[PDB]
Amino acid sequence: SANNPWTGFQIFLSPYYANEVAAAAKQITDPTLSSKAASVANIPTFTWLDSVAKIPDLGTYLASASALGKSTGTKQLVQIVIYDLPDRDCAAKASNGEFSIANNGQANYENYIDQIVAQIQQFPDVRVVAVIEPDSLANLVTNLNVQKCANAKTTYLACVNYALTNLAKVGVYMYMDAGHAGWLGWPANLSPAAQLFTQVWQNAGKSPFIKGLATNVANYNALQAASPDPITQGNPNYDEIHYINALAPLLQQAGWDATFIVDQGRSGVQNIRQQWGDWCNIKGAGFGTRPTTNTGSQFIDSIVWVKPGGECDGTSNSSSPRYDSTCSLPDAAQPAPEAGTWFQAYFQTLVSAANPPL
């Protein structure tokens, strides 16, 4: 639509990912691959606020972005992910979320949001784009037979509402997570998904800052596939563009001119999964299309890199208390360290298998 949040802004580059990448590139012994790896630090990614302990870091990023804007005569944009719901990841075998519904989870989440708002309010010259709560509302479409999800439903809805309502007051542009083509893109799931997302938008007051939805976050699907990946048989929506083209009109019919952003950070290599549901450290992945607002679709504001490639999805060590057995499957790269920590061998392959090449 007319207001693309990225137009006219320079994207602030994550210092944390830059430091991970710089350390990683020194460990790559081929000097040409090391040079290509070093250049990843100049590709914009999202910063994940996956615990309250990261909120002070957000304040430093906003202040640095504000000063860089003044130093260079530009307007800066910071990209963040809000990811701390109570009883987070209700359908997963293991969750690293720090809040629980049974221990004041909603109140703790609201305090987490209030602290984020307090930082953003101090730097009105910096634009913020936020992805709201990966792996949350999509579970309320297909996973209500999971008792933990059924019990979390009202809390997930109330917490997402609090985030949307309060971040809108400080002018944050928001995209709610909407799974991916192999989750909500099944034709039978499209209408229940559109009904849920529209309800959430209505309850939050239909703010123009609620721009739309994010897809493929931390996944591996193509935006536009040359031929369908075999894992997709039975689903005519075999890539993200098919999913978005099918869902967007349903949202428009309800009065919401929604737009989309699509993660392509680990999408460069297709046909590497044994089953569509396999999500953990998929072996052979490559960096995909770099972030751009030249998307080829009316409905897509930007291709983005939401999940930072090289940070592990989960451990393969079956003795860890954070162990998710999805991370032991055959198409998962192993041995793998704990979720969120740097996985050097995986990063090196992301660089070597990048498509387009770095």
Cis peptide before 335 (omega within 30 of 0): yes
**What secondary structure letter does DSSP report for 296?**
S
Return the SS3 of 151: helix
**Whole-Å CA distances, 351 to 112, 146, 343:** 35, 37, 13
Which residues partner with 76 through β-bridges? 10
What distance in Å separates the CA atoms of residue 47 and residue 79, rounded to the nearest whole number? 6
Experimental technique for the deposited model: X-ray
What distance in Å separates the CA atoms of residue 99 and residue 76, rounded to the nearest whole number? 32
Whether 89 is a known active-site residue: answer yes
What distance in Å separates the CA atoms of residue 25 and residue 14, rounded to the nearest whole number? 16
Q: Of 230, 217, 101, nearest to 158 (Cα)?
A: 101
What distance in Å separates the CA atoms of residue 56 and residue 95, rounded to the nearest whole number? 23
Contacts of 213 (CB under 8 A, 6+ apart): 175, 176, 177, 178, 197, 247, 258, 260, 261
Active-site residue among 84, 263, 313, 324? 313
What distance in Å separates the CA atoms of residue 297 and residue 122, rounded to the nearest whole number? 35
Active-site residue among 89, 229, 263, 301? 89
Q: Of 301, 334, 324, 294, nearest to 96 (Cα)?
A: 324
Binding-site residues, please? 48, 50, 180, 183, 219, 279, 307, 311
Lookup: tokens for 64: 């640095």
What distance in Å separates the CA atoms of residue 300 and residue 287, rounded to the nearest whole number? 20
Whether 177 is a known active-site residue: answer no
Q: Which domain holds residue 152?
A: 1-358
31-38 vs 344-352: helix axis angle to the nearest 10?
90
Q: Are 268 and 222 spatial neighbours (Cβ–Cβ below 8 Å)?
A: no
**Whole-Å CA distances, 180 to 4, 138, 212, 237, 277:** 22, 9, 14, 10, 11
Whether 301 is a known active-site residue: answer no
How many Cα atoms sit within 13 Å of 187 on the Cβ side? 4
- Domains contained in the chain, number: 1
What distance in Å separates the CA atoms of residue 40 and residue 21, rounded to the nearest whole number? 7
What distance in Å separates the CA atoms of residue 33 and residue 24, rounded to the nearest whole number? 11
Q: Are 120 and 128 spatial neighbours (Cβ–Cβ below 8 Å)?
A: yes
Q: Of 50, 71, 172, 51, nearest to 123 (Cα)?
A: 172
φ/ψ of residue 211, rounded to 5: -80, -35
Cis peptide before 357 (omega within 30 of 0): no
- Among all chains, which residue has been given the structure tokens 């559109």? 194
Q: For position 137, which CATH number holds?
A: 3.20.20.40
Task: State the sign of the Cα–Cα–Cα–Cα dihedral 129, 224, 21, 326.
Answer: positive
Burial 256-273 (b: 16+ CB within 10 A, else e): bebbbbbbbbbbbbbebb
Q: Are 10 and 95 spatial neighbours (Cβ–Cβ below 8 Å)?
A: no
Quickly list DSSP for 39-51.
GGGGS--PEEE-S
Q: Of 284, 290, 281, 330, nearest to 310 (Cα)?
A: 281
Task: State the sign of the Cα–Cα–Cα–Cα dihedral 250, 164, 48, 46.
Answer: positive
Q: Which helix (H) or strand (E) holds 32?
A: helix 31-38
Resolution in A: 1.4
φ/ψ of residue 199, rounded to 5: -60, -45
What distance in Å separates the CA atoms of residue 108 and residue 99, rounded to the nearest whole number? 7
344-352 vs 15-26: helix axis angle to the nearest 10?
90
Contacts of 11 (CB under 8 A, 6+ apart): 44, 76, 77, 79, 291
Q: Of 203, 225, 207, nearest to 216 (Cα)?
A: 225
- Among all chains, which residue has been given the structure tokens 């055959």? 330
Lookup: tokens for 315: 């451990």
Contacts of 35 (CB under 8 A, 6+ apart): 25
**What secondary structure letter does DSSP report for 96?**
-
Binding-site residues for substrate, please? 48, 50, 180, 183, 219, 279, 307, 311
Active-site residue among 84, 135, 229, 263? 135
